[PDB]
Amino acid sequence: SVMEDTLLSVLFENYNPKVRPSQTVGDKVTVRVGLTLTSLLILNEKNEEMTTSVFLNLAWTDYRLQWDPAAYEGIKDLSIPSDDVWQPDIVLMNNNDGSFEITLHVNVLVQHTGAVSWHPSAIYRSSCTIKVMYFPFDWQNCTMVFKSYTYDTSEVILQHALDAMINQDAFTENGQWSIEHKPSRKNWRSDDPSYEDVTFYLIIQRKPLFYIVYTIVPCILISILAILVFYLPPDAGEKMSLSISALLALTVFLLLLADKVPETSLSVPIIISYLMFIMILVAFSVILSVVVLNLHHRSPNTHEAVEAIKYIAEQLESASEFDDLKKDWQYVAMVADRLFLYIFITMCSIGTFSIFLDASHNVPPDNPFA
């Protein structure tokens, strides 16, 4: 009773819905912003698009809602729909690639002397620079800048919790990636009067090892038929034609591979590294098989009286066997041996190279997890 109807009344009589919990132009209302992440569902590492979900915990004080006996001293804590406070119509300078879901228009926790607690989980369409640099083992970092899209920091100050909180705090276990750390730094670019956005850093690490495995098999298994086509010559010289069949076959195979590679990066591309040199490794088996094909080509051919008849017989046979013996002199196997071992150098050299680069790529550019 104690002026309850009265209080109750006066409050709703004088209280202003559309007003800011501050008095004039000054230090403003110090709103607390801090989100406990739920998990993340889709990383479009290719366009640098980020759809995650977290809690929008906001909290500041409404010294305009401090109650009295019944709602203050009666029930120190009571729930009341928002819709009555300035809400950070927050957009993300890079990210905020789309609207809020479970972000605004939801109830809030209002304390006795005016404290306000609003904890809503939400899904948000963002876009961070995971750029086409989300695959190097050295990976990269990003700028996630949150802030309102009609307000300018003049009638409120934004403030954070931790900066180490981490993003693996609610990292998706469903992620083909992994994370090292999440930096959180408060910002106010001076290119705009409006103090604004906060930059949040993603020192992301995404190592999904699954198909590069059977990709290796091509390179090496194709090599099987490759070393084979380079081995088949002094193995079965008649490989002559069958050889060409091999490369038709070998080339179509690698071209189909050419088919799956562009359409697969089509959703998760970054530096060429792997492709850069396998591209070379490609060109390598490609041309090596084709010049060996020219190795194959280079051969212009390969690619008394009684006794007289006898004598005429003696000369017939012998005469042309030298001729076909000439073909021997012409297609001997010197080259095959020499370049099948130049094949030895080439393929085992260029092989242990990307082997190496790849080797160097996973270990060397790994520690910049920062």
Added chain:
Amino acid sequence: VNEEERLINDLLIVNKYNKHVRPVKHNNEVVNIALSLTLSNLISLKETDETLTTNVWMDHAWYDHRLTWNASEYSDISILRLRPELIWIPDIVLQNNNDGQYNVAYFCNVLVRPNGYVTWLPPAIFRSSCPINVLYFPFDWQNCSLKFTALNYNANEISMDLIIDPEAFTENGEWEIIHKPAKKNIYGDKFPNGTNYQDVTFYLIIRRKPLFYVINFITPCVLISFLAALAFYLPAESGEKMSTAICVLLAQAVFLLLTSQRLPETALAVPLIGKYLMFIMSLVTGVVVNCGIVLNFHFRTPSTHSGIDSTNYIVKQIKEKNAYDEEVGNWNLVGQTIDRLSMFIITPVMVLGTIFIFVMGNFNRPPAK
């Protein structure tokens, strides 16, 4: 007329009743709210990303003490309707599966009992991120966990107490629903200094996998395998089909490669385990290897891959001479090795082929354990 005008003016739902005020008889323990979960349908499953779109009947109950009516409300009709904006409605949040706001399970017509008890239960088209993990593929196919409850209120403003999942499991799913237990609870946490919001915890333990991919996929293996199997039987019946035998490698090779290509395609659409994916590609490689083996083994050998008297002696010379050539080749033929080859092809096919369904079983036995 029995005080009716006056009484609903007494309730005035919106005006007299505090709809922005939840009748929890003021600050105390809580309004006894109860949630009931009944899946009406499961339309889409995504095993790979642990996401599910499913329909639920959001059966809700709580007593609206200001809702109790009198004769011209209560007894006039011991049951009547009143919209959401005129009925307190719990702010049920799909705790770990509402990362996709609820649809038409929102602000819908509710049922008004006579003594305040109210009943609101409409349809929920929802999306969830259930505990798939890369362990929602072994035969147990995990247990999908979900919690439902009134998000906003705590343990002194709300108490929610507690149906099979296959009750409305979708029959067009690529999986199988084995069980679905239901038990409510309430729980505080470390950073919170007080207990609050009670919830409906419903675990769905399921299983899935086709008996169809097995059909057209192993089918080609014993068919293809017989080619590579015959491959070694064929080197005998007629190894002279050198080039043509070579053709078949190109051909059995291109077949092999994109067959594996279709594999990841459906793969990405499905988080496949490492245990199974290897037996597939391991064994096709078994043939791939033996195709390369086919190569060499099929082209592996270095070669198989008195005057009148004077004159004819010349010929008997040329005779014998190239007879040595002729034979230098059968030296290479290597034919008493033939059967052993295809015998030691049989043995291994038996070894590995068995090794697989041997392993098939050694893991087929323990789950059935």
Added chain:
Amino acid sequence: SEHETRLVANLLENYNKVIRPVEHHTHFVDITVGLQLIQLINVDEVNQIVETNVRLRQQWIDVRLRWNPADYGGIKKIRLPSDDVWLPDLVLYNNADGDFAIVHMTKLLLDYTGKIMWTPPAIFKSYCEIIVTHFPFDQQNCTMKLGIWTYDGTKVSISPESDRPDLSTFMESGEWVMKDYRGWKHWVYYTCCPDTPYLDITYHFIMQRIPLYFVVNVIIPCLLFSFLTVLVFYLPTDSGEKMTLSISVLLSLTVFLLVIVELIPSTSSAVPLIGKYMLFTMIFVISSIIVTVVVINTHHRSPSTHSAIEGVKYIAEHMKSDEESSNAAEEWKYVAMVIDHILLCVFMLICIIGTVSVFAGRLIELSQEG
């Protein structure tokens, strides 16, 4: 004039729309519903989706709408804005995949008496069985039930009105054809609850599907592939000298149909059918494989066809006689006789299992055709 303001004002005050014209503890609210379907713009047999239009002919009564010389007298039948009406949450039980569209904001039919109707040109997306048994020759009847959503019998009741076909306005551009369409009513009380539950209209669509496009191309490559198989068999007789050639065409053939089955899975899963069908193609074609298995295996089935001066004349003709009986040996194997049994052996067997394919295929359509 004619109680001008007094008549429309009184009407608004003591009139309510939230309420339903309940008349004592009895038959519920007499709801008359029906389908008036005149267009089916889009549907997918595969996902069993249907976006069509049906004017929702509703018919029921509310005495409160009865009038005297000051509303009836004004103009017999008057059409009131729908707002004043309690609109049922009607919905497709196992369907309802979409909101009804165009029903809101419409016209309502009022009579001097009270009779009322409102046929809304509702267009919406639906969801009913078609399953893999949707498009056969023997059809399936899509079960489509419709009735009040959240209201039980104790408050509202609907009932059929007339029989009308589904083909009355069926799509002539449909990839299907109708046979019959029946709709009867019922009330569903459930063993669960002792209560008297909602009413509903159950439609059943009986219509056979499948254009003949997919058909023409399944069988053309079959006969054509049976031509090359036929060649497969005939060649060893007319040109066995191209057995290898035969090999090439089997790599050809095989890849082609292995690729044919690729199409199937895409198309089939892209357009629904009862598996029992592909079973035909399955063995029939594994038959060309099973047969080329044996036939070319059999084709390659054969070991390798897959004075003193007087003296040397004798060592010589000897040289020739040895080889001659020898060449007789390779021909000893390619007897050119079993080649004719294999094409005829299988020509009949393919003419028979083809006629077998032909059999259930035609038997099934001597069932469909019906």
Added chain:
Amino acid sequence: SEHETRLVANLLENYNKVIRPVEHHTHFVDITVGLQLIQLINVDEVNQIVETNVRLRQQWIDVRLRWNPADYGGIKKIRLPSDDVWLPDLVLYNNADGDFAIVHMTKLLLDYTGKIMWTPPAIFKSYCEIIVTHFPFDQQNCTMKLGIWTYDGTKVSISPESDRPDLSTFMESGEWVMKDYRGWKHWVYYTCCPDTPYLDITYHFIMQRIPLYFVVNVIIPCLLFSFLTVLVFYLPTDSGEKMTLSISVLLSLTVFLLVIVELIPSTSSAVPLIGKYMLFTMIFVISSIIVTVVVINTHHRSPSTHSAIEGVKYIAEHMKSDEESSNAAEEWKYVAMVIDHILLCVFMLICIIGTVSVFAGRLIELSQEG
């Protein structure tokens, strides 16, 4: 205090939001537009659709917003939310594919005098020419008109604000590159009506396309194929032993060219390139075609290649000699003299066609690069 409540309330009462600050029958409401694309998110030249960042600077005056010491004296310039304002129905003429995004419920600033600015952070959906003339090396100028939508120069007038580049905030992630962009004003009166119609801002986007990755993959299998066809020339003249062997390649390669066709037309369908680009491939690719067919038909062009005891000796020797003849005949068929002709015949052809293909390539690259 200072007429506190009397201040604020008076203002609300006599003020109609919807009223347009019309001042006598003349100047219309003078309102200026000023678009600053902060940045672009995504574009589809094929479908000529872009999602872009726009901060719309909208200016106009409402002499009704001027104040005295009780509004301006309170705090010079202040923040008043939109609603109360008459929002010009801005619209991109031949564009407009989408609603302005974040135009709604934002705020504006009123000066001690009245002058108001409305500059809400937009990003929206656009629709500009690209025609099949945008992907050219010679680009096309995206004609984009902007201006007042449903009001005339008599009721209102949209005017420009300044010059600024489009590459000022052009997307560096675009598959295209900018040349320049200018925008000048205009007033459109129609011979239709004798009246004076709306004003408009006309954008002109002059940018040339094609990211260079494409460039490398495609022209290299061409010089690739060039060498195989190059080998197609040299293989035969230096070795006609594997004519059929090359039969293979001709199959493997045009099919390679066939499958490259699926890939790049979808590119074609993926990105609108001026068709005259297509003819490059047309004759180029098709000469691979006309040349083959002749080269290989010619490759193919050749008939079959692609005392008494003493007399015995002479009837026998005579037998060896005329078959001797015969051998030379078929070789008199596949000569190595003109296969050399076709070699230089066409290689000059290829160096002609090729250098001719390089011609227009180089030529308008002499125009584009400028």
Added chain:
Amino acid sequence: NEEGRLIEKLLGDYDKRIKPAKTLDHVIDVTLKLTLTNLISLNEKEEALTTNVWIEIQWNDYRLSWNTSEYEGIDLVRIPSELLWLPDVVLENNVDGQFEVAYYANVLVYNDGSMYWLPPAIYRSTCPIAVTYFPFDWQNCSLVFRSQTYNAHEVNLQLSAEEGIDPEDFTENGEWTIRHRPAKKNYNWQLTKDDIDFQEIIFFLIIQRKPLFYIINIIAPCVLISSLVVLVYFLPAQAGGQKCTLSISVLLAQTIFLFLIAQKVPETSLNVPLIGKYLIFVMFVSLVIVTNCVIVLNVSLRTPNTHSCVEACNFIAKSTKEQNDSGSENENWVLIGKVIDKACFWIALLLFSLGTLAIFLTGHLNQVPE
């Protein structure tokens, strides 16, 4: 000039949902017209389209002719949507999607009570293009639209030219073309048996398409293909013995290419419309290509196999010569190529005929509808 009082006067009596109908037996005079401006999506196989229509709306309601303070002030007024009778437009046969931006826009009230309004609308529709619209003779797109609310005994729509156009702003990036746009104003009475006519708006659109790009992709390949097979056909006479199988390699290659085509463009017609006539010539000119093609191997399949001590021994050896000669003789009577050579000219003129039959007829199906 009572400016305030007048506004306040009518608003007193101002009636919303009531039509400006003098009385009830002669309806109001409603004017409408549409100027096409965007034809956004042509999915003819499903008979649907999306267009930005200028909905020229006009009618009369002197319920607000004003005095000196509003009519005379300015013979022009722009008053909000929700403030006068509004035609809820839709295309009977087409509009399958509720209008977008076609309503809720500023209307126009001159001074005598003339009302003008014209919102732009992007919406979906379904015009003809039913197993026809792909010819050279075009199916006239007939769209009739009217208010879907009331019927012509109270409402009456007007129109204008029914002779003059759809190509007024027919899109230049359409894969088609328009040649005439007729439009009639009419009453309501359809096949379905509806009475009380509500007049509507008929939209004829007989348009052309087929600007083939795929034509010569189809035309040069087939010639190359025909030649390829004619290679198969004449190349044999030129080709060596190792060519029978040579020819085969081509069949394999020829149809690998073939059904790949069969898979390529069939896709084409499913994503876009369909028609069988043009379809018939291809597959059957294609099946004949295949036919004489396999016929060829069956042709290069046909033929039987081409697919004193001194003297006693001199006697017998002179026999192997004549003996084997009888054998090589075999070859003769077997491979005397009457059938083959003639097979070249067989397909040749047959080629000319298949071609003439087809392109001559394509000449006709472009020349009758020309």
